[PDB]
Amino acid sequence: YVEKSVNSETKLHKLADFAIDWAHNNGLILRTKQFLNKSDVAEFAPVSLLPSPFPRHAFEKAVAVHEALQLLYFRVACDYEFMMDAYKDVVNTDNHLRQLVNIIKDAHKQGIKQPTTLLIMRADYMLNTLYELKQVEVNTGAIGLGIDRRTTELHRQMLRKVGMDTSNSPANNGDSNMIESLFMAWEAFGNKNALFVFLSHERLQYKFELRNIQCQLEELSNGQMKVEYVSLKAGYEQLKLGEDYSLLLNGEIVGVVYSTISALGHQANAREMEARRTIELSNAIKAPSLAIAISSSKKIQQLLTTPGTLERFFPSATEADKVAAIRETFTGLWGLEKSDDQTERRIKDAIENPANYVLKNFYDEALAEKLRTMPERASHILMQKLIPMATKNYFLRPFHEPKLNVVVGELGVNGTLLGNLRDQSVRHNVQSGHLLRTKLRTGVGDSPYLF
Amino acid sequence: YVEKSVNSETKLHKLADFAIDWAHNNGLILRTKQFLNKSDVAEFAPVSLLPSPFPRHAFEKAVAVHEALQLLYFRVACDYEFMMDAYKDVVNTDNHLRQLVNIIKDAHKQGIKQPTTLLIMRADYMLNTYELKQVEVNTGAIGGLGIDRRTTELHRQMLRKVGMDTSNSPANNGDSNMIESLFMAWEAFGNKNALFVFLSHERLQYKFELRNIQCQLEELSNGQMKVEYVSLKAGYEQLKLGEDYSLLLNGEIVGVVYSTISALGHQANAREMEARRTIELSNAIKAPSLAIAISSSKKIQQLLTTPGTLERFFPSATEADKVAAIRETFTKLIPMATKNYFLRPFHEPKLNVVVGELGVNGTLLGNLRDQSVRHNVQSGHLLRTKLRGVGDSPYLF
């Protein structure tokens, strides 16, 4: 439909020019690459011109499973023994992970000072044509929900400009749930003079998004919430543990620490690591806690696909629907350290039908040859090959002429969960917000047009 | 109060950083100096950190006289003989003005094809050391009313950040009146397929503001209003007069031409002048018409101060209050000085002694044939502030 809708270069440029102005007028913006430390100039956030086609059934399935998925990862994060078991080996050959695990060990040894925590999740999916919905990533660490909403809103404007029906563009209000969840977390701390802290880099494209969150939180609190920004580097000097286990930022009590510095992604130096430790040992409500953040590493994602493992976290028969709904979104994955029957027959099928698999990258005849003659097995993993649905769209990026390209995407589904780490109870578990991230076959922001 | 409120460089920068982010998040923006033809990047509009002190009495006086002032200039614009009399001499030593006057002559000779017109006015004032003095009247290319509103809104945020009362910051909704007035003008043309045209430069800082007006007009019309942009240069090729005196933009009827290209300010070439003539001879509703635009030249401003001349345009005794209120604002002027911080892209904010001018905005929708007036509203204001400039808004005392 995108190619049919845009029938000339004149129309393309009128549409793009409207879109770019709309983006700036409505906060669909980022700091520039030249000045990631300054807000004096902004550029529009890179987006598709129109919302990419996406099947309704796959979308509704991804949305429907999300709350169950958040409950799963919350329970994983609460299961100290499972997490320590999952990390036993990789800690000995990854110093960064070792330090993070040691902070969780220190926090657990001293007893949980703050039971309330806020999980924030984006689950990523792709549409396999070799359509079926397949989970490809879970992110519980540093999570642009305002940008996603504004992208949906831009796309409705653009749909009207080409005479298309906007009812197939689904509602996208993830930022409202986020703000409410963060406000609820701050109220739960029980001190109206306690700070709300954005743990964040000095260099960041998304500063405008964070400021929007600040303004909304200040409005919700009727001006009572004091908001501050600090990095882990600056935090080494400015953050301290009080004698009552309060987190003190330059001597003032911190009620909530909302992190946009990825626990797994950011290679922190020794000082940054100590600042992280100070935060984790404090009684501040963490959004998210470190355990929540590392509950969704690739290792744990893989472990959760093994036989019987979902059932450990959903032991009751009343939750069998949640198990089935999550499992049917799993990508086929078979670690070759195991020599059980299901893995062995899988190896044989991959040798005979190598076009259907990937070995980790080996493909087709090379994959088959490697499986035939590899002794080496424990480090390799066999997976189902995924072929994404292709469509066509125009990308808007600052100073790039828009062109029609063949594109593929991933669906992101967002939500929050507010829970108690001591008894594993859940006060709030909501799916809200989504996005498409679209690339040529980093890519651009996008939103679904349901069919 | 500004100096007392900001008691450290650390606080100053936290406030400024909040303000700059707020500006970008809320559309208080301009195209960059490097790329006045492109919207890919934007900078925040230059503003004061806090609203400058301004006396309430002077402000209320400037607001109160505004509708009378719009009625005055509308009646001047309707008085063909007065305008031709006023320009008899200056046309012989100002070729630019001569060409504009000749277009009005050509339009008048053929009979007025479109009686409905929209006057848009900014009146500028300064505080003489206080008494309110009118220094300029602008009935040509106005714009920036959304920027003025957002500046007021930013200033309320900043007042709260330093614990000051926001009730002395007056309401600033000039953009709503503008949009309603332009929509009313478009409805009055009587053709739901007729275009709304922004007559505008390809290079312009305020493009974001115009797009905002477009979106609001599209919303008000329930998607029926088709909006286009054209310059006078491109207009020379793309605008024509139809055999029924319709203004045609690439063959499509134009219902309203809203101008942000100043009639008196922009030194137009021959082609641009012909495009202007084509617009003026058409039946499109002009916002504003050329007669309205040149009704507020410096020459006419001066002529309106001479004895008995206001009374020619307000002949009735029932309008004697309007005459007195306008005449009281007539004029060496020494402006009130205060202190403030300026926020400009890539400039560190510093405390300076500053002076300003008050701008008061409004619209008037009227009929050029019988001089009747359907709509006459003051709405919107601004401060423009300079070292003894930037956008600013008043803190009334």
Residue numbers in the entry:
A (entry chain A): 8 to 137, 146 to 158, 160 to 376, 385 to 399, 402 to 467, 478 to 487
B (entry chain C): 8 to 136, 146 to 347, 411 to 467, 479 to 487
Can you list sentences taken from the study reporting this PDB entry?
Glutathione, the tri-peptide γ-L-glutamyl-cysteinyl-glycine, is the main low molecular weight thiol antioxidant in both plant and animal cells, often present at millimolar concentrations in vivo. It is synthesised in a two-step, ATP-dependent, process: glutamate-cysteine ligase (GCL) catalyses the formation of γ-glutamylcysteine (γ-EC) from glutamate and cysteine, followed by the addition of glycine by glutathione synthetase (GS) to form glutathione. Cyst nematodes have exploited a series of gene gain events to redeploy glutathione synthetase-like enzymes during parasitism, within the syncytial feeding cell formed in the host root. The most recent expansion has been coupled with a diversification of structure and biochemical function that has given rise to enzymes that are introduced into the host cell, and likely possess novel substrate specificities.
To explore the catalytic capacity of nematode GS-like genes, the G. pallida representative of Clade 1 (Gpa-gss1), one representative from Clade 2 (Gpa-gss5) and a number from Clade 3 (Gpa-gss12, Gpa-gss17, Gpa-gss22, Gpa-gss24 and Gpa-gss30) were heterologously expressed in, and their proteins purified from, bacteria. Remarkably, each stage of the evolutionary process that gave rise to GS-like effectors has witnessed at least a 10-fold reduction in apparent glutathione synthetic rate, such that Clade 3 GS-like proteins have not retained canonical enzyme activity. Comparison between Gpa-GSS22-open and–closed reveals a functioning ATP grasp fold. Residues in the ATP binding pocket of St-GSS1 are highly conserved in sequence and position in the Gpa-GSS22 structure (13/15 residues), and similarly conserved in sequence across G. pallida Clade 3 (structure guided alignment, ~12/15, n = 24). In contrast, there is considerably more variation in the di-peptide binding pocket of G. pallida GS-like effectors, yet, this variation is not evenly distributed around the pocket. However, the glutamate of the di-peptide is exclusively coordinated by interactions with charged side chains of residues in the binding pocket (R, E, 2xQ, N, and Y). All six of these positions are substituted in Gpa-GSS22 and Gpa-GSS30, thus suggesting that the lack of canonical activity is because γ-EC is not accepted despite the potential for cysteine to be accommodated. Variability in the glutamate portion of the di-peptide binding pocket is ubiquitous in G. pallida Clade 3 GS: of the 24 GS-like effectors there are 21 different amino acid compositions in these 6 positions, not one of which is canonical. In summary, conserved amino acids are only absent from one half of the acceptor di-peptide binding pocket. Given that GS effectors have no appreciable rate of ATP turnover when supplied with canonical substrates, yet all display perfect conservation at the catalytic arginine, we infer that GS-like effectors possess a distinct catalytic activity, which may involve alternative substrate(s).
